[PDB]
Paper text:
Full-length VipD was crystallizable, but the X-ray diffraction of the crystals was too poor for structure determination. Various attempts were made to improve the crystal quality, and the successful trial was to employ a truncated VipD lacking C-terminal 46 residues and to dehydrate resulting crystals with 30% glycerol at −20°C. The structure of this truncated version of VipD, referred to as VipD(1-575), was determined at 2.9 Å resolution. VipD(1-575) folds into two domains which are roughly discernable: the N- and C-terminal domains, designated as VipD(1-316) and VipD(316-575), respectively. Ala316 is at the boundary of the two domains and located in the middle of the structure lengthwise. The two domains interact with each other mostly through secondary structural elements. β1 and β2 of VipD(1-316) form a “mini” β-sheet together with β11 of VipD(316-575) in the C-terminal domain. Likewise, β10 of VipD(316-575) is a part of the central β-sheet in the N-terminal domain. In particular, the two residues of cPLA2 (Ser228 and Asp549), which form the catalytic dyad, are closely superposable on Ser73 and Asp288 in VipD. Moreover, the Gly196-Gly-Gly-Phe-Arg200 sequence, which forms the oxyanion hole in cPLA2, is also present in VipD as a Gly42-Gly-Gly-Ala-Lys46 sequence at spatially the same location. Likewise, a similar groove covered by loop β10-α14 is present in VipD. These features indicate that VipD is a catalytically active phospholipase A2. VipD(316-575) contains ten α-helices and two short β-strands.
Author numbering:
A (entry chain A), B (entry chain A): -1 to 558
The structure:
């Protein structure tokens, strides 16, 4: 990860990041997996946050959560995000999301038929308190360095909260206590009166700013520090996006920038949708609203796209399943290969036809790429919600669960021959790869050839752009020679790799190669003679899924 | 330490703090020392910060610095404060303060005959960078948890700074490199151009706030975390007070509230005196100026007055030495005892006179008290400075050194008998005391009697306020009985303790006792008879220094 400040230098000196993970299977193969996921971004969308439950379950089962360091979100995303961040556990997170009387979450204390937002913010505080209190007690006896000052502040805040709730006759020791509280409206009113009594800010003698009475973003840091090493991961670094109505742009609140901001206050603001709530208002007097109504979620600063999962839920069924989108493309790819093959009589000998363009397939992934975008169809669950249809809910949930699983699966790819893996990744992204031990040997032997090949690919492009095609064939034959002799690849493997290389050159040249090939074949047809170009083209149209598969059969027999 | 948020509860439940430190000497005595000093507050005053050098030397020799967790300051104080905070070492801190061409620190880039402030802020950045870079390299090889993200950000900032300075042909590896830089004006101009090129803020795609390119208050946290335990104390938690000209009140910037604030920018602002600099301006567009021109320094939030040293320098010689102020009072105290004794013929038998009041000595410390206020006379060194008189400088320095030493000495007191110590401290502040091991036995035996005595003191007051003096004598005799029999104190010790008790009762009763005594003596004189009141009064006027001394002779022979 690189901070935007590093871009201010005249001569940047790229640091080493990790975007890939090459490993060697017990099977003896090589697998290209994405790097461990560090950040999670939950896009806004209103009450479609019931789905996030499914998405979390997926990450849970797959053990992806534990290695998260950052969590950012807006609207429903923001809440979910904060519950994750505050180190709550799935069991309870699940119990919360599905169990909160969001219907009674919308106070009437508002005006003009809109909630004031104070109640929602109050339930959040009760939650953060309850969960942070449990962690606070997970700390050991010592408590030495400035960890004595932090421990005190937290202990005191939790103290303040309880004194206020006790007097109110409210007692919360766990998730259920909270959920039950939301069901009683008389109790909810006691909550508001109780917690609303706590001031927004506290200034001192000379009007200096004092510690926020409420649990803040910064307290998450205070808590993380105090905890034992093996438990520090439980608490995440939370970012909350919001729309600053006054400045009319989004504003992000986080533990590293606005550590003195109330967790509950920010999350409530992030969900202060203009349709359901009256705008919020910060200390500066600027008006705040739902973080998802003006623009999309900004990325987490210190991380790389490759390390961050972005979940974005939307109403209706605008999006299509991932697996059914893969097989739809795969089928089209195979269809195109067939189209090229079945057209050989007209293409080479004679007939009335005209070839299409790889441009009707330029939506082909020629290099390894990680897609970290999780799209979820929420169905009939839109921003405005009053319908907890036992169905529409269970559908949106598992619908979100499946999506996380699908995208999570599209990450790992497995190749048979290390040269293949490396050629797909590209010598470029090879340096930003986290290579394994058992792999290092063959990988670097293979990268040597990969470089020799790359140089040739590059040269072909270079020479064509200068309008010199005299050596295109020769260079191509050379690349094949390297794959056969130097790399020693089976006939099938070689065929697949060479196919890939041909494709990558076409890409790098922006179809300048394919045009040449087609022209050569065409002239050859006119001369009533064969052409070396035909073989290369048949390889160009090979189906990419095959090129990457471990089929062990030629493109022709690839079914799927 | 208690946060002001804990004051919001209906029923506060006082936490245990530490304001005292009872220990047992090898001599076999008991000493009442102040608690370890946690915070240091350096009041504003303009360029009188040359004196702070002396004050630091004192703390250094006395090992008081190492246990500091917080450092707060304004104006000259702010700079000094930040250099301390950034873990710099005395040797260099000394070399810096005295060696900076503050004369050439005041750029001409300003307007209306005032510095713009950009240069001063630039030298500060060069300093923070240089010192933080050294610490950054003190970190070990591992760097594991989110300590990888921090380490990166710092490494990058330092990187940015150097790239800018290198291009400028500037190289700083130590304090001297910096000092020398300040001597060349052509070099200083290169610095400004170089560092001024770095933007104030950096916003992203959607206008989200991004990491400050400059070293921030928050980076101090980043650095502290990264360092090895035994070295975490090197880096202090910095607060910087400033005057917000626009809002016309002071504003405090700190690592826990405004972690994203530039250290250099804040310190420069804190010293942006209206006479020498044009006002500063923050992101909100509010105007900023010297933190010491509008009001005094506010206290560090989580700490107790008892744990914080406050240094406040002022021009001229308004203040008087501490030792010469003690002996001046001591002499007056002894003089008063003499006045009471030499007046006994008139007081008891007959003569024309009229007694003064303990109110001419109510400036007498009846209970143990810690004075943490260090006052320094800066002499002819005022806010506006152009006079680095080799003298006036050395005078202000050592003048500040002596003061820290004096006040630092007035802290420890040593008593012979544990009951004495406890009676001076007061059963009240006894609970907030950090008692030692070897002491616990006798202390709690002694506190039992102390309580019995307190109850009696209290009772005397209680009964007098209800206009009942019938048992004043009896109660007093009882207290003496407890000191003689129960505590078993030498005649001298007993006399001293009883004196103290009599005084404390007078205080608690607001001279209601002394009035009674005097009246009793007066009536007794009229009846031509002696009075028990005379003894008590002679004890009331005993000199407090004696009462607390280990003289081992009666008040009469106390010289000093």
């Amino acid at each position: 990860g690189s901070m935007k400040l590093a871009e201010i230098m005249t001569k940047s000196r790229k640091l080493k990041r990790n975007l890939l993970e090459i490993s060697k299977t017990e099977a003896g193969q090589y697998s290209v997996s994405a790097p461990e996921h560090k950040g999670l971004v939950l896009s806004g969308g209103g009450a479609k946050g019931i789905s996030y439950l499914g998405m979390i379950q997926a990450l849970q089962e797959r053990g992806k959560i534990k290695n998260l360091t950052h969590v950012s979100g807006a609207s429903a995303g923001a809440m979910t995000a904060s519950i994750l961040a505050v180190g709550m556990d799935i069991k309870d997170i699940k119990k919360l999301i599905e169990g909160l009387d969001i219907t009674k979450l919308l106070d009437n204390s508002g005006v003009g038929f809109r909630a004031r937002g104070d109640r929602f913010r109050n339930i959040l505080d009760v939650i953060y308190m309850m969960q942070m209190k449990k962690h606070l007690e997970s700390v050991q006896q010592p408590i030495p360095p400035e960890q004595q000052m932090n421990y005190g502040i937290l202990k005191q805040k939790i103290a303040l909260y309880e004194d206020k709730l006790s007097r109110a006759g409210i007692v919360i020791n766990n998730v259920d206590d909270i959920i039950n509280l939301t069901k009683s409206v008389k109790d909810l009113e006691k909550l508001d009166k109780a917690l609303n009594s706590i001031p927004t800010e506290l200034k001192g003698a000379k009007g200096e700013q004092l510690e926020n009475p409420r649990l803040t973003l910064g307290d998450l840091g205070r808590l993380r520090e105090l905890l034992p090493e093996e438990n520090k991961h439980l608490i995440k670094n939370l970012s909350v996006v919001v729309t600053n109505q006054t400045k009319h742009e989004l504003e992000r609140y986080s533990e590293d920038t606005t550590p003195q901001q109330s967790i509950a206050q920010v999350v409530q603001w992030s969900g202060a949708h203009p349709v359901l709530f009256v705008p919020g208002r910060n200390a500066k007097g600027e008006y705040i609203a739902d973080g998802g109504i003006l623009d999309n979620m900004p990325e987490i600063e210190g991380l790389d796209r490759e390390e961050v999962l972005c979940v974005k839920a939307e109403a209706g069924t605008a999006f299509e399943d991932r697996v059914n989108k893969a097989k739809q493309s795969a089928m089209e790819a195979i269809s195109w290969f067939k189209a090229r093959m079945d057209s050989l009589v007209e293409a080479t000998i004679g007939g009335k036809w005209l070839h299409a363009t790889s441009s009707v397939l330029n939506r082909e992934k020629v290099y390894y790429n990680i897609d970290n975008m999780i799209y979820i169809n929420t169905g009939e669950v839109t921003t405005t919600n009053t319908s907890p249809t036992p169905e529409q809910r269970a559908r949106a949930v598992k619908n979100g669960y499946d999506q996380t699983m699908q995208l999570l699966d599209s990450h790992k790819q497995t190749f048979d021959h290390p040269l293949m893996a490396i050629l797909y990744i590209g010598h470029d992204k090879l340096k930003d790869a986290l290579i394994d031990e058992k792999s290092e040997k063959e990988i670097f032997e293979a990268s040597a050839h990969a470089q020799a090949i790359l140089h040739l690919q590059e040269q072909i492009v270079k020479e064509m752009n200068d309008g010199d095609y005299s050596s295109v064939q020769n260079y191509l034959d050379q690349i094949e020679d390297i794959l056969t002799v130097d790399a020693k690849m089976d006939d099938i493997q070689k065929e697949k790799a060479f196919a890939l290389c041909i494709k990558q050159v076409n890409f790098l040249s922006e179809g300048k190669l394919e045009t040449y090939l087609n022209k050569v074949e065409a002239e050859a047809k006119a001369a009533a003679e064969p052409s070396w170009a035909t073989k290369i083209l048949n390889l160009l149209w090979a189906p990419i899924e095959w090129v990457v598969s471990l089929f062990k059969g030629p493109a022709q027999d690839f079914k799927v």
